[PDB]
A paper describes a structure:
The structure of the PcCel45A-cellobiose complex revealed a single cellobiose molecule within the active-site groove. In all cases cellobiose is located at the +1 and +2 subsites of the active sites. The residues Asp114, Met17, Gly131, Tyr67 and Asn92 in PcCel45A X-ray structure form direct hydrogen bonds with the cellobiose. At the +2 position, the amide nitrogen of Met17 (N) and the carbonyl oxygen of Gly131 (O) interact with O6’ of cellobiose, and possibly stabilize the ligand in the active site. Furthermore, the O2’ atom forms a hydrogen bond with the hydroxyl of the Tyr67 phenyl ring (2.9 Å). The Asn92 OD1 forms hydrogen bonds with O4 and O6 (2.7 and 3.3 Å) at the +1 position. Another carboxyl group (OD2) of the catalytic Asp114 side chain interacts with the non-reducing end of cellobiose (O4) at the +1 position (2.7 Å). The comparison between apo-PcCel45A structure and its complex with cellobiose reveals that the ligand binding induces a small conformational change in B1 and B5 strands, where the residues Met17 and Asp114 are respectively located. Closer examination of PcCel45A structure bound to cellobiose revealed that the Asp114 side chain in the PcCel45A structure is inserted in a hydrophobic environment and its carboxyl group forms a hydrogen bond to the O4 atom of the +1 subsite glucopyranosyl unit. In addition, simulations of the PcCel45A bound to the cellobiose (C2) molecule present in our crystallographic structure and occupying the +1 and +2 subsites, showed that it dissociates in a shorter time scale than C3.
The GH45 family is composed mainly of β-1,4-endoglucanases from a number of organisms including plants, animals, bacteria and fungi. On the other hand, PcCel45A, a member of subfamily C, lacks one of the two catalytic residues and thus employs a distinct catalytic mechanism different from that of the GH45 subfamily A members. It has been recently proposed that PcCel45A utilizes an imidic acid form of asparagine residue as general base in a “Newton’s cradle” proton relay catalytic mechanism. Despite the same fold (double psi-β-barrel) and the homologous sequence, the PcCel45A structure is significantly different from HiEGV and MaCel45A.
Residue numbers in the entry: 1 to 180
The structure:
């Protein structure tokens, strides 16, 4: 996409969970299940505001524990998250280090979703004792997402991806150039 970001409506991803998504990089939180997506897919860098991932909805499915490869299941449920946040390259090399010259993370995944624990998404997705998974994602209509957006936290906050057709398309728009 514009800026060299890798923004595809379906693919393979790794998955983690994080705490504190009340002030996310898109500039609006949301009451439903939400996630951060890795910088290369988010469409912006730290401090540059919302990228074109902002507010898009994705169905996530975990099917492998890379830390416990002998574990055959059960995994969690497929959940639908709204992207509100950025998992930046800086400080997240294992999972969010995808760059245009090296587009997979240390688990070979081209995308990563960091699922917010606060609003319940990770409890539906991660079996107890299994904090990181790999699997698949598919962008879906936000008709499939339960919840309401929070208010703007600053000028330029954007979740307009929630009404956009699936990638390839433009809503909030990408900022700057993808990390190389
Ligand atoms: O770095 C992305 C993401 O990781 C989260 O911690 C992971 C950790 O990286 C992984 O090694 C462990 O097995 O599972 C935890 C939880 O999923 C961390 O909570 C996030 O803040 C961070 O953005």
């Amino acid at each position: 996409a514009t800026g060299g970001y890798v923004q595809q409506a379906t693919g393979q991803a790794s998955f983690t969970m994080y705490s504190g998504c009340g002030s996310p990089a898109c500039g609006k939180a949301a009451s439903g299940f939400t996630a951060a997506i890795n910088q290369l897919a988010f469409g912006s860098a730290p401090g540059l505001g919302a990228g074109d991932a902002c507010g898009r909805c994705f169905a996530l499915t975990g099917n492998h524990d890379p830390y416990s490869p002998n574990y055959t299941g059960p995994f969690g449920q497929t959940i639908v998250v709204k992207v509100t946040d950025l998992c930046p390259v800086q400080g997240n090399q294992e999972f969010c280090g995808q760059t245009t010259s090296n587009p997979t993370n240390q688990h070979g995944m081209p995308f990563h979703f960091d699922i917010c624990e606060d609003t319940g998404g990770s409890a539906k997705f991660f079996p107890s004792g299994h904090g990181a998974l790999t699997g698949t994602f598919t962008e879906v209509s936000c008709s499939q997402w339960s919840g309401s957006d929070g208010g703007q936290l600053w000028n330029g906050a954007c979740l307009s991806g929630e009404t956009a057709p699936n990638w390839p398309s433009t809503a909030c728009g990408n900022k700057g150039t993808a990390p190389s």
